[PDB]
Amino acid sequence: QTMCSQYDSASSPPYSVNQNLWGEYQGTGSQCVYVDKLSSSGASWHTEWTWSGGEGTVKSYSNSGVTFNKKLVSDVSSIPTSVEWKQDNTNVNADVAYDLFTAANVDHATSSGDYELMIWLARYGNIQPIGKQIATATVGGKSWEVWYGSTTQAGAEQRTYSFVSESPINSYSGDINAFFSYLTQNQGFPASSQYLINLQFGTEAFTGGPATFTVDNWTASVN
Template identity: 50%
Template sequence: MQLSLLFLSSLVAASPLTSVEKRQAATLCEQYGYWSGNGYEVNNNNWGRDAATGGSQCTYVDNSSGSGVSWHATWQWSGGEDNVKSYPYGGKQVARGQKISAISTMETSVSWSYSDTNIRANVAYDVFTAADPDHVNSSGDHELMIWLGRFGNVYPIGSSTGTVNVAGRTWELFVGYNGAMKVYSYVAASPINSYSANVKEFFNHMESAQGFPASEQHLIVFQMGTEPFTGGETTFTVDNFSANIS
């Protein structure tokens, strides 16, 4: 989960591809290096790097259009074994003021890979909601995480409530608190490198099984990325991430 504020970076370069689609690229090595375009955003987001004894990370925007964004992040981190060092992510820019109960669909798809999986990290969607539609985008009242991959001995916040079936798949659901924010983490049993789903189905499950107040909560951020803990140099690649929220 990202715990840092978004900071804008001027490290953006763009060149026209066609009149409809533009090819855009950026190299983001600053702690919160940021890029946005075509309704998407990418952040290097090294929010937990102070817990490391060594390492670094850079994130690269490869391509973007209205139908999605492609990017990759290369990192290596040592020390602070049980601390998340960063959350490089691609996000869908969302309109503020949307209550979860009023959203019909959150259709999304992603294809991703790791060059070396001898690491401690997860690959996860991260979605914040809050009663205040203008809540800062670094946290929320509630957090939904969908763990598509888990490498090494890492676990979500909270305790396991057992297995559940959501959006046609079986997940182990962990529930706990990060400070005052309630966190729901749906963890796949093995990596899902190509994934498509309607994320609204997870909120429906949270509402029915966990009492999530969908009629009171607004969507704050909708992101997909990886949380590195430790590992030698590796590259996390997102071939395409897309989302359609309506």
């Protein structure tokens, strides 16, 4: 659809495609999100965009998500997921990433919580993760840079762990739970007291364009 509004959702349980321009007031430009194929078996979609000014600030996060029942990270058996995407015009400042949120209380909004786990499949321009690199780890057969940082806004101190690949991975498959398992044994992540609440995948656009981000297919499940 031309659901190029501020916040829009198209869902076919348990999947959804979400247009999210939560930074539309920091720069200037336009962005629409189009659904190509959406059913209970997966999501395929694309978004075109152009943004200027307010560099260093994410203007939007178009993404596909999967709805599921809040459950303790330590109770998660596996998070299988696969994706195939492509970025048309790399002369921009944006990233392609999986975004996972956990909170110490399921009775908390899904916008944040305590921890955010970003798995960067691509990094364009001069943008970089929050905080500093604290390690490099091998997860799911691949090498990732582990970054850690914590931002506090409106009193919401949020801890972010970012796994970044050296080069773009257009075709990825893996068990995301492996990242949680790594964080629990190597970075003190409190798995037995954190509820996985949100799982999304998409792109954060800072500046640049016209550019097109396409997700040929996307699947994700939380067990």
